[PDB]
Amino acid sequence: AMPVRVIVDSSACLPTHVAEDLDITVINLHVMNNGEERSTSGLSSLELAASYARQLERGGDDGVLALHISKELSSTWSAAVTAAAVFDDDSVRVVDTSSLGMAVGAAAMAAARMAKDGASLQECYDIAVDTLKRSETWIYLHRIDEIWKSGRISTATAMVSTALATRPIMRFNGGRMEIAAKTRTQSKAFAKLVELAQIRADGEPVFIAIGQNEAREAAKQLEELLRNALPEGSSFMSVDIDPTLAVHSGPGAVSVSAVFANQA
């Protein structure tokens, strides 16, 4: 048997050389630059059928695990489930992530490593699900213009962009996007983020991926802050926020994807 093959989309934010080293297939989400405005698009079921069949062929049909952006942020999952039903029962297993970014990238790396040791599809599936259940995703927005126009803030969350404050920490819970702090300076926002991750760590080492979009310096300052505050033996990785997501986060955005010892 050939190892199970792992596929994510670009929203997972895996660095290119990591995806390459671990043989994780990356499919890019769409950015349309037409006229002045940028917009984005999920993956169609047709592109996923092609992408999955190609990984099945390559892995001698011993299984594909697919990990895509949350079904509440994108039509991708819905396309993935349609493409997966085109193959024999359980050739393609679609993880229902309720997440995006390196919480998903992390689940994919754990699944790829297990696949490498000959783990079955079900077993790679379980590792991926367990990594996600123990993750959190926070985002610092340096401005709220692009998040507001994205359609991913429910009106229950904020009826008017004013309700977001000016530099909030956002968090994903149950797939959906929430305000974790109505902060107004980067300093206060970072301090609060560090606070939340620290509580959530609960004295145990954490794995952390810090994402940035045009915020290289800021992401460095935040990492430094998190190093001092998080339990000893925590590890830190840097990633670039997928340009598809950067369309909706705006410039200056910094994300923290964390995997913890325990459940929430």
- Does residue 211 interact with ligand PLM by CB under 6 A? yes
Among 44, 120, 150, 186, binds ligand PLM (CB under 6 A): 150
Calpha distance 142→139 (Å, rounded) = 10
Q: Which is nearer to ligand PLM, 73 or 112 (CB)?
A: 73
Residue 70 annotated as lining a ligand binding site: no
- Does residue 257 interact with ligand PLM by CB under 6 A? yes
Identify the H or E element spanning 249: helix 243-249
Cα pseudo-dihedral 217, 221, 226, 227, rounded to 10: 100
Q: Which is nearer to ligand PLM, 55 or 212 (CB)?
A: 212
Residue 91 annotated as lining a ligand binding site: no
Is residue 62 classed as helix, strand or coil in its secondary structure? coil
Stretch near ligand PLM under the rule CB under 6 A, chosen from 115-123, 189-197, 223-231, 238-246: 238-246
- Least distance (Å) between residue 92 CB and ligand PLM: 20
Q: What is the residue-wise DSSP string for 89-129? A: TTSEEEE--S--THHHHHHHHHHHHHHHTT--HHHHHHHHH
Q: Which residue has the tokens 């325990």?
A: 262
Q: Which is nearer to ligand PLM, 54 or 152 (CB)?
A: 152
Q: Give residue number: closest CB to ligand PLM.
A: 101
- Least distance (Å) between residue 58 CB and ligand PLM: 26
Q: What is the residue-wise DSSP string for 203-228? A: TS--EEEEEEES-HHHHHHHHHHHHH
Identify the H or E element spanning 153: none
Stretch near ligand PLM under the rule CB under 6 A, chosen from 53-61, 86-94, 128-136, 237-245: 237-245
- Does residue 249 interact with ligand PLM by CB under 6 A? yes
- Does residue 183 interact with ligand PLM by CB under 6 A? no
Residue 238: both structure tokens together: 């840097």
Asked if 152 and 177 count as a contact pair (C-beta separation under 8 A), the reply is yes
Residues that bind ligand PLM (CB under 6 A): 29, 40-42, 69, 73-76, 100-101, 137, 139, 150, 152, 211, 241, 244-245, 248-249, 255, 257
Binding residues: 40, 74
